[PDB]
Amino acid sequence: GKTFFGQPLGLSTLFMTEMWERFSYYGMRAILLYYMWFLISTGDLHITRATAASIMAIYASMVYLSGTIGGFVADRIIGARPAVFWGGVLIMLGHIVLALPFGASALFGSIILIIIGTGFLKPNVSTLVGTLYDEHDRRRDAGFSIFVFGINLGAFIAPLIVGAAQEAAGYHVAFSLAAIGMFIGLLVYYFGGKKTLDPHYLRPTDPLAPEEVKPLLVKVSLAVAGFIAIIVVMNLVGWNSLPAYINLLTIVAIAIPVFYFAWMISSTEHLRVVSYIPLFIAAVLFWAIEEQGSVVLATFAAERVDSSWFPVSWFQSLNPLFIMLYTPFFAWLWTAWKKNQPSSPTKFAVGLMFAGLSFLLMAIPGALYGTSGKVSPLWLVGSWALVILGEMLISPVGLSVTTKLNSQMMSMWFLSSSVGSALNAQLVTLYNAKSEVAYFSYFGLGSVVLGIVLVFLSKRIQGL
Ligand SMILES: CCCCCCC/C=C/CCCCCC(=O)OC[C@@H](O)CO
Ligand SMILES: CCCCCCC/C=C\CCCCCC(=O)OC[C@@H](O)CO
Ligand SMILES: CCCCCCC/C=C\CCCCCC(=O)OC[C@@H](O)CO
Ligand SMILES: CCCCCCC/C=C\CCCCCC(=O)OC[C@@H](O)CO
Ligand SMILES: CCCCCCC/C=C\CCCCCC(=O)OC[C@@H](O)CO
Ligand SMILES: CCCCCCC/C=C\CCCCCC(=O)OC[C@H](O)CO
Ligand SMILES: CCCCCCC/C=C\CCCCCC(=O)OC[C@H](O)CO
Ligand SMILES: CCCCCCC/C=C\CCCCCC(=O)OC[C@H](O)CO
Ligand SMILES: CCCCCCC/C=C\CCCCCC(=O)OC[C@H](O)CO
Ligand SMILES: CCCCCCC/C=C\CCCCCC(=O)OC[C@H](O)CO
Ligand SMILES: CCCCCCC/C=C\CCCCCC(=O)OC[C@H](O)CO
Ligand SMILES: CCCCCCC/C=C\CCCCCC(=O)OC[C@H](O)CO
Ligand SMILES: CCCCCCC/C=C\CCCCCC(=O)OC[C@H](O)CO
Ligand SMILES: CCCCCCC/C=C\CCCCCC(=O)OC[C@H](O)CO
Ligand SMILES: CCCCCCC/C=C\CCCCCC(=O)OC[C@H](O)CO
Ligand SMILES: CCCCCCC/C=C\CCCCCC(=O)OC[C@H](O)CO
Ligand SMILES: CCCCCCC/C=C\CCCCCC(=O)OC[C@H](O)CO
Ligand SMILES: CCCCCCC/C=C\CCCCCC(=O)OC[C@H](O)CO
């Protein structure tokens, strides 16, 4: 009878929950770099703009990493429904912290809250969407597509609204709007969830057995102790600047898949695991370029574009806009393309090439016009158009090609975005007006080349 776009009514609740959470997240992301610039300009924040860019990237890296952990905590300890609720509460607090009359001193607390909160909420709302359907329900894929539409919608409207609020009423009010966005999500989630969600998910579905508690405690304790020890040694040898800590986090984020790879390669489907390395690197490099949209392209938007008549943060709406515009087209495409549809490794290769082209495009205005003036907003429009085209090729088959090639390596796909952002934490420090053309050219061309490399390797990989 009555449905939400053909789906169970409970999808409306989760749709709105994620829409408003993504609203809060991308609303914050769209103005946070500019906020740090402001704090730097007033002498409140004693870092370079390069470091501010680095912060944005490592922030994203840790958000993605945290998301690979939240599912475990919900499934084994607190339950998916409380994970979403309390995750949302932490996220809201994270935005409230930036709305308070503080300056740079509140940045770290806000970042930590949102990292933990998003880690709790993001994997677990997706889990709850699954719970709406039986195993044999063929509506499942349609339901997730609608859910993703809500995600992109929140991501789309947030820079517009939060960016406009920032211009009108300042950063603290704008950040409060992000907080209010999460609050709306929590309201709908809490009261809507009670109506449609299975009570089963109020509790962990795979609770720790009695003998499992101590080994988990030891595991967590040793990890924390090791991490703290590393920080201690860092401060003793004088490696205690902010870039030093960012480097530590970069190393951690990259070492986790590296250790996974070394583990699987050591421990004869050995060929498959090795075959995934080029795909994983391609994913990492793609996500690096895609995630630079809120950092390097955001910098370009503010410094190099004729945008005096609208909030420059609005450029961040282009990424989810193009995802929304492309999605129904590629949905039709992969069904219509019956004969000789490209393999998943081929999609990765071409996807990386489009990401490469998105940067090669951005090298053109500086090379043609110089880098001291300002250029058309359409250069950025074209860039996002290209990189998102790449996303349509690599993202829908990413988890698929990883699974078909089990629980540890599955997480590596989600880790690719974390690793890409960790790489960005290093790379974006190289971007400035002087290096602009070389930056876009070099990393653009590199991605295209590595895409061409993957094309040659596509035949061998598809067989495994
Ligand atoms: C076939 C569907 C593919 C959709 C993606 C295509 C996007 C391609 C974009 C490349 C051209 C955009 C850059 C052009 C540009 O900057 O012109 C500036 C000039 O108009 C200044 O007024
Ligand atoms: C300023 C930095 C603070 C760092 C964040 C501190 C808070 C960290 C974790 C709090 C989240 C705990 C969520 C679990 C909870 O409260 O209920 C779970 C349980 O009741 C469900 O069965
Ligand atoms: C310091 C400012 C933030 C203080 C947070 C106070 C409100 C926190 C979360 C709002 C959640 C909205 C859903 C309302 C709710 O869950 O109330 C539950 C109540 O009816 C019985 O559990
Ligand atoms: C996990 C995959 C890792 C692959 C990373 C590929 C790129 C890694 C390091 C490149 C650093 C050197 C870039 C130096 C550079 O050309 O900067 C350009 C600009 O600053 C002036 O040319
Ligand atoms: C299958 C659809 C997507 C295919 C993408 C086709 C891409 C083909 C060629 C890309 C040309 C790359 C140009 C490299 C370049 O101009 O670098 C010059 C600059 O680095 C000077 O230092
Ligand atoms: C459990 C996996 C997630 C790991 C969470 C640890 C995240 C720790 C730090 C996040 C990165 C933030 C670094 C930038 C930063 O701290 O800015 C603070 C301001 O510079 C204050 O001067
Ligand atoms: C630190 C300030 C935050 C205060 C939050 C309000 C606390 C009052 C009640 C908490 C209710 C916790 C409900 C957890 C939960 O699983 O919600 C799920 C809903 O049942 C819908 O799935
Ligand atoms: C029941 C708790 C749920 C609360 C939802 C989040 C509320 C967030 C902000 C409320 C309004 C905060 C206004 C911020 C503000 O005063 O800006 C100060 C200006 O900078 C002063 O010029
Ligand atoms: C890094 C922040 C998140 C850290 C969460 C890891 C928690 C640390 C050790 C595991 C202890 C979890 C509590 C055990 C529990 O509640 O389950 C009890 C068993 O189900 C009873 O047999
Ligand atoms: C410094 C952080 C390193 C990790 C230490 C975190 C310790 C946090 C919680 C440990 C709680 C001890 C586990 C015992 C427990 O939870 O029993 C609960 C059961 O439900 C009782 O039947
Ligand atoms: C439950 C929260 C526990 C904290 C999460 C663990 C990660 C903690 C720190 C990671 C390193 C980030 C330090 C950033 C920072 O503020 O350094 C600034 C230095 O004072 C440089 O002068
Ligand atoms: C399973 C992941 C475990 C991997 C963690 C291993 C971390 C090992 C070493 C971290 C060293 C931190 C680097 C500090 C650094 O980059 O130099 C400091 C600045 O460059 C100079 O101030
Ligand atoms: C009605 C257009 C489709 C919906 C656009 C949503 C808003 C997304 C981005 C707005 C900021 C970037 C657009 C700037 C722009 O396109 O300017 C083009 C003109 O040629 C300006 O010179
Ligand atoms: C229903 C799927 C088919 C929809 C067709 C999508 C094509 C829409 C826009 C393509 C924009 C192409 C940009 C043209 C261009 O690059 O012109 C460059 C000139 O040199 C600028 O002066
Ligand atoms: C289906 C895509 C077909 C190919 C798309 C266009 C490929 C991109 C560029 C092709 C022409 C390359 C010209 C490069 C070029 O002239 O650079 C100028 C010099 O580097 C300036 O010093
Ligand atoms: C399929 C559409 C692709 C549209 C983008 C194609 C871009 C192809 C080549 C652009 C490379 C421009 C590099 C310019 C350059 O490096 O010259 C340096 C100048 O002398 C200034 O440093
Ligand atoms: C199937 C996806 C491929 C889409 C490629 C369509 C774009 C084709 C050509 C766009 C090349 C970008 C360079 C445009 C350019 O430099 O023109 C100069 C501007 O007119 C400056 O006023
Ligand atoms: C797949 C169905 C949806 C297709 C979306 C079409 C978007 C594709 C490309 C948008 C790139 C915008 C560049 C606009 C442009 O270069 O025009 C230049 C002007 O003609 C010169 O003033």
Side-chain angles (χ1 to χ4, degrees):
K2 173 155 186 52
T3 66
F4 186 68
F5 294 101
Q7 317 302 315
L9 288 177
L11 183 60
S12 69
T13 297
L14 300 175
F15 180 104
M16 294 215 68
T17 298
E18 249 308 84
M19 183 186 72
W20 283 111
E21 182 270 328
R22 292 287 83 184
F23 173 94
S24 72
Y25 184 75
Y26 284 114
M28 173 270 298
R29 292 284 303 181
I31 65 176
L32 182 59
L33 181 55
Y34 302 147
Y35 183 49
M36 284 190 285
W37 290 4
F38 169 73
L39 293 181
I40 290 164
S41 72
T42 60
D44 183 75
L45 181 54
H46 293 83
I47 67 179
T48 62
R49 283 198 174 183
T51 299
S54 184
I55 290 177
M56 292 293 289
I58 200 63
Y59 189 0
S61 184
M62 296 299 101
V63 165
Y64 290 136
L65 179 59
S66 187
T68 71
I69 311 169
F72 177 91
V73 180
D75 291 345
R76 305 229 66 190
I77 303 181
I78 67 174
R81 286 174 65 176
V84 173
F85 180 84
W86 290 113
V89 168
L90 294 175
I91 291 166
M92 186 184 58
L93 296 176
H95 297 298
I96 292 176
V97 164
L98 292 184
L100 295 178
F102 298 106
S105 68
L107 287 178
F108 185 66
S110 173
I111 287 174
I112 296 300
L113 285 170
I114 286 169
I115 285 169
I116 297 172
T118 307
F120 275 145
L121 184 147
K122 198 69 177 68
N124 287 307
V125 182
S126 176
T127 295
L128 289 178
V129 171
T131 69
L132 302 173
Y133 301 94
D134 281 305
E135 286 179 336
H136 297 279
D137 202 326
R138 302 191 181 184
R139 291 180 300 170
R140 191 171 290 260
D141 291 350
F144 272 100
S145 296
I146 289 157
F147 177 65
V148 168
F149 179 62
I151 287 176
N152 298 324
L153 205 61
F156 171 76
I157 66 175
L160 304 180
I161 294 169
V162 176
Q166 186 279 324
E167 178 181 59
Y171 285 104
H172 289 321
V173 170
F175 284 129
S176 79
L177 262 67
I180 291 172
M182 187 64 250
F183 179 68
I184 294 177
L186 280 170
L187 279 178
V188 176
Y189 172 68
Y190 178 81
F191 293 104
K194 282 181 161 179
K195 296 187 174 190
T196 50
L197 295 183
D198 197 314
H200 191 68
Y201 302 105
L202 291 170
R203 291 170 141 174
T205 45
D206 183 25
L208 297 170
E211 287 287 302
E212 288 186 288
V213 176
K214 180 175 71 177
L216 179 56
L217 187 54
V218 173
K219 225 160 178 295
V220 172
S221 298
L222 287 178
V224 174
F227 181 76
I228 288 181
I230 291 172
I231 296 185
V232 170
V233 177
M234 280 173 57
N235 277 266
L236 291 184
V237 299
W239 293 349
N240 52 16
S241 69
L242 182 54
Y245 286 105
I246 296 183
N247 290 341
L248 170 60
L249 298 180
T250 301
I251 293 172
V252 170
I254 296 181
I256 291 173
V258 168
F259 281 175
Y260 279 155
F261 266 139
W263 192 354
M264 301 182 63
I265 289 180
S266 302
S267 178
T268 46
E269 299 298 337
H270 168 274
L271 293 178
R272 287 188 186 174
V273 182
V274 177
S275 182
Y276 181 72
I277 297 182
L279 299 178
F280 179 82
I281 295 178
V284 165
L285 295 174
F286 173 83
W287 288 125
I289 292 179
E290 194 266 354
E291 291 150 357
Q292 285 197 24
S294 56
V295 185
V296 168
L297 295 192
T299 298
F300 188 93
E303 296 179 342
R304 292 272 289 124
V305 174
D306 288 313
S307 54
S308 66
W309 45 282
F310 66 97
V312 66
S313 52
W314 286 8
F315 277 100
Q316 297 305 306
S317 291
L318 289 170
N319 180 297
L321 180 56
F322 279 118
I323 296 181
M324 283 188 295
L325 295 178
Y326 287 162
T327 294
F329 172 80
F330 280 88
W332 163 87
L333 178 61
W334 301 131
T335 62
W337 201 333
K338 304 284 191 177
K339 279 295 175 296
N340 295 26
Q341 180 177 352
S343 61
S344 292
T346 299
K347 296 177 180 177
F348 270 58
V350 181
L352 181 57
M353 294 182 68
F354 274 117
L357 294 179
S358 79
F359 265 23
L360 285 176
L361 175 71
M362 290 303 300
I364 297 182
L368 182 60
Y369 295 113
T371 60
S372 70
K374 296 183 182 181
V375 300
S376 171
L378 295 178
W379 289 105
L380 285 176
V381 176
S383 186
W384 264 298
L386 285 168
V387 73
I388 294 308
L389 201 56
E391 187 164 336
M392 300 303 302
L393 299 178
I394 184 174
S395 186
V397 303
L399 182 56
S400 180
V401 72
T402 306
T403 300
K404 298 174 183 173
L405 198 65
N406 205 123
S407 179
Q408 312 254 18
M409 183 169 159
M410 188 176 304
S411 67
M412 282 191 56
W413 162 247
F414 303 95
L415 280 178
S416 63
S417 62
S418 179
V419 178
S421 288
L423 174 58
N424 282 344
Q426 305 299 312
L427 298 186
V428 302
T429 63
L430 303 179
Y431 178 80
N432 54 65
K434 276 76 177 179
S435 68
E436 174 184 310
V437 175
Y439 185 96
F440 285 131
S441 300
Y442 182 80
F443 293 114
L445 177 57
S447 303
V448 175
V449 170
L450 289 177
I452 293 180
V453 168
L454 193 52
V455 168
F456 271 86
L457 302 176
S458 181
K459 289 299 177 179
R460 184 176 298 265
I461 297 180
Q462 182 49 44
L464 277 59

